[PDB]
């Protein structure tokens, strides 16, 4: 009989995870301030990672990685890539970005197709600076037919306590799932989703986590950690995958809630707390 607490009511994903734990008959939900627990579904802002793994005879597990905010923030992601030797400036799959509060003089040098976009879209530099990071807007994206429309790809990644990178087989396209999207490529561009896009996707995901691995790894800590991430990609007309942003607490597709949340319990929860694959390992 394992125990777990809930400290995030706004969580849409772990609302199903906590529901399945009570359906096993081997997991008991306790109060949100009860220190005697095995699993923790903490909040997003200011999570007390300090009070974890300090209870005698209790192997504690948290659904977040301390220090993963360097990858899930706008300004941090740009800084992380440019300052890491394993990523550096010469990064093929990451668009030209600049941090503006800085890299103001550096931005104007590369400015002199010239359209950018700021976030935390206009061809003129002056307007953008006056509004306020500034990323190079992909002026030539891949367009689906019929419709001549723009889209993006969401991939859910689960990393357990042993830091094993697992990629969900079922992705979504916020223009469409993989099975429908794969058929379109084979009929229009004469290629598969596995080779053209998914290969670059498995590269971006693996490279980012291995870069920040020795900074957030919980191999020799007093508490283990796991976290479900949400990568957002972009594909141009040359079939090249670009990295946009990484979400710390992402959402999931409606029909995929049953399958994905079950997988989280199996390889990220039951792997630590055994009871009485839908993931592609990288």
């Amino acid at each position: 009989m394992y125990t777990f607490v809930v400290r995030d009511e706004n969580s849409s994903v772990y609302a199903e995870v906590s529901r399945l734990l009570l359906a096993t008959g081997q997991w008991k939900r306790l109060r949100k301030d009860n220190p005697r627990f095995n699993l923790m579904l903490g909040e997003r802002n200011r999570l007390p990672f300090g009070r974890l793994g300090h209870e005698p005879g209790l192997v504690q597990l948290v659904n977040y990685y301390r220090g993963a905010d360097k990858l899930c923030r706008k300004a941090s992601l740009v800084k992380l890539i440019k300052t890491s030797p394993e990523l550096s400036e010469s990064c093929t799959w990451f668009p030209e970005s600049y941090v503006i509060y800085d890299e103001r003089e550096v931005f104007l040098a590369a400015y002199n197709g010239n359209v950018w976009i700021a976030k935390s879209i206009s061809s003129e530099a002056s307007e953008l600076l006056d509004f306020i990071v500034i990323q190079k807007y992909l002026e030539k994206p891949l367009l689906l037919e019929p419709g001549h429309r723009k889209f993006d790809i969401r991939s859910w990644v689960l990393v357990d306590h042993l830091y094993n990178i697992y990629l969900y087989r079922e992705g979504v396209l916020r223009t469409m799932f993989f099975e429908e999207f794969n058929q379109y490529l084979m009929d229009a561009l004469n290629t598969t989703l596995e080779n053209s896009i998914l290969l670059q996707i498995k590269h971006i995901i693996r490279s980012c986590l291995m870069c920040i691995e020795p900074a957030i790894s919980t191999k020799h800590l007093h508490y283990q950690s796991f976290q479900l991430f949400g990568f957002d990609f972009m594909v141009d007309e040359e079939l090249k995958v670009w990295l946009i942003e990484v979400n710390g607490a992402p959402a999931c597709a409606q029909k995929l809630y049953a399958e994905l949340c079950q997988g989280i319990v199996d390889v990220a929860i039951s792997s630590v707390f055994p009871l009485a694959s839908i993931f592609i390992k990288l």
């Binding site: 009989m1 306790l30 301030d33 009860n34 220190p35 005879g57 209790l58």
Partner: protein, 422 residues
């Protein structure tokens, strides 16, 4: 040197007090004559806590026998370990209490209350460091209940910086002698709240259910009920009598087990209650079981403020720590979350007689309110018709004093309910 002055008052208090001294004398290897015949030096390392060393290297129990009638104390002296007690410590009257708290606390009792303190003071002057006072009595009587609380009030006046500890025995309709027992109990509790630091609620109803349902005794006698108490008192004062890695000095017990100056009523528990040796997880499960509670209160109906457990005998200390932490994690809904690590456990290497290993339970549970509620229901039931009050009013008491005791106890219950919903 941390010496404790033991006091037993009344019929009940003396009979269970005598059984207490029987067991610990066996544990410390003291024959009925008062000489030492043990085998280990651990039995004499902290022997000065309860025993006074005599002239011929004997050990005379630092205990005072008090009663208003010689009927009970003469039975103790004519008992198996009656020649071990100091002859001067036998202070008794002749009139009696007659199961009357009024006679014991105001009239007849006050005529002898000074005679006892003269023995109390004499036992205190020989103490290198007076630890506290240990009282053993019942609350359904007159001598132990009336004069007992009077001694407490008198001692506290003389010794304001000494710890007050009592082993109060609770009356019950099942095991009763009179009908005025709830009257005496209510009047005693009010005194125990304001003038004591520690109190072990020992319900005779719980002692009866244990003998009847668990021990399978078709007809339990007082002697059987005393065995449960005698073994319980042996477990509670284990660390006090035997050298431990915790260094118990009674005062620490008060600071740790009592979070609020009015909530200091504990629930004793013992396990096992046979040749087949029990294992560590078996002792732990029984120790928190409701069938081993000696206060007739269901732990699941309340929450534990503080919990102290002691394990005697040779056992895997690692496994003990695991099973204890196991209960807290499997039953976290019955432990308050505003007191971190409110469950401590120590291990004694010397087991009692008859058992290779045992476990004694002490818990300040808020479920003890049911004990005071049961008395309050029996009290008001009679007091609303002013029944049997002429036995008290004829001793100089008024109805106003009873009403104050009823209110003071009901307010105590409200406090236990207050922190139960925290």
């Amino acid at each position: 040197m941390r010496e404790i002055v033991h006091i037993q008052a009344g019929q009940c208090g003396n009979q269970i007090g005598a059984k207490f001294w029987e067991v610990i004398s066996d544990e410390h290897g003291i024959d009925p004559t008062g000489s030492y015949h043990g085998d280990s030096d651990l039995q004499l390392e902290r022997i000065n806590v309860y025993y006074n060393e005599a002239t011929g290297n004997k050990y005379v129990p630092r205990a005072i026998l008090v009663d208003l009638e010689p009927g009970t104390m003469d039975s103790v002296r004519s008992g198996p370990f009656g020649q071990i007690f100091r002859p001067d410590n036998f202070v008794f009257g002749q009139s009696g209490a007659g199961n009357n708290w009024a006679k014991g606390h105001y009239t007849e009792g006050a005529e002898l209350v000074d005679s006892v303190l003269d023995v109390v003071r004499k036992e205190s002057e020989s103490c290198d460091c007076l630890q506290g006072f240990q009282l053993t009595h019942s609350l359904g009587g007159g001598t132990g209940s009336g004069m007992g609380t009077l001694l407490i009030s008198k001692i506290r006046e003389e010794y304001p910086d000494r710890i007050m500890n009592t082993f109060s025995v609770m009356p019950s309709p099942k095991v009763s002698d009179t009908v005025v027992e709830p009257y005496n109990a209510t009047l005693s509790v009010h005194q125990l709240v304001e003038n004591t630091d520690e109190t072990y609620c020992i319900d005779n109803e719980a002692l009866y259910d244990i003998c009847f349902r668990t021990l399978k005794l078709t007809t339990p006698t007082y002697g059987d009920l005393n065995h449960l108490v005698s073994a319980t008192m042996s477990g509670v004062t284990t660390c006090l009598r035997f050298p431990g890695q915790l260094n118990a000095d009674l005062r620490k017990l008060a600071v740790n087990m009592v979070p609020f100056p009015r909530l200091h009523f504990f629930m004793p528990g013992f396990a096992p209650l046979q040749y087949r040796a029990l294992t560590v997880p078996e002792l732990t499960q029984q120790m928190f079981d409701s069938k081993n509670m000696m206060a007739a209160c269901d732990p699941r109906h309340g929450r534990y403020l503080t919990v102290a457990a002691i394990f005697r005998g040779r056992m895997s200390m690692k496994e003990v720590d695991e099973q204890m932490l196991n209960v807290q994690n499997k039953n976290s809904s019955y432990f308050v979350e505003w007191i971190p690590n409110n469950v401590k456990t120590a291990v004694c290497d010397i087991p009692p007689r008859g058992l290779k290993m045992s476990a004694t339970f002490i818990g300040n549970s808020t479920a003890i309110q049911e004990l005071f509620k049961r008395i309050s229901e029996q009290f008001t039931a009679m007091f609303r018709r002013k029944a049997f009050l002429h036995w008290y009013t004829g001793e100089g008491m008024d109805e106003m004093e009873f009403t104050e005791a009823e209110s003071n106890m009901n307010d105590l219950v409200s406090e236990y309910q207050q922190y139960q919903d925290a």
